[PDB]
């Protein structure tokens, strides 16, 4: 379906704090550039309403649990 | 590593047009709400510089190809 650590990453991206996202990322030993790019992503996603991020999470689960991703 | 269709989705999200992202999504038969949420995501990611999106893509590949996602 989906790499468990990756899912954690996405969960923290959409619904968690920059803090927890940050910890999540460090597992993968990103370089400073990739880490910076990822925080730029977080900052902008955080502009979206809560409801919107919940629906993106729900959307993400529907993709990863599709017959198409089996 | 990663569901091939999902990866396509992400690729189109970060580096493609709203158009191609849109086609990509439809595979998964998203409802109108999930589709709307996903387009709201696209619109905001599109605010980020090209370079930034390239690095997020590179970051994404590093995650999916980690020993941790084996």
Swiss-Prot record, chains A, B:
GO terms for biological process: signal transduction. Synthesized in the uterus and lung. The keyword Zinc does not apply. It comes from the Eukaryota. It is found in: Secreted. Antiparallel homodimer; disulfide-linked. Interaction with LMBR1L is controversial. This is Uteroglobin. It comes from Oryctolagus cuniculus.
């Amino acid at each position: 379906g989906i790499c468990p650590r990756f899912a954690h990453v996405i969960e923290n991206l959409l619904l968690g704090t920059p803090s927890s996202y940050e910890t999540s990322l460090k597992e993968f030993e990103p370089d400073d550039t990739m880490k910076d790019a990822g925080m730029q992503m977080k900052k902008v996603l955080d502009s979206l309403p809560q409801t919107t991020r919940e629906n993106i999470m729900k959307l993400t689960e529907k993709i990863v649990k599709s017959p198409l991703c089996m």
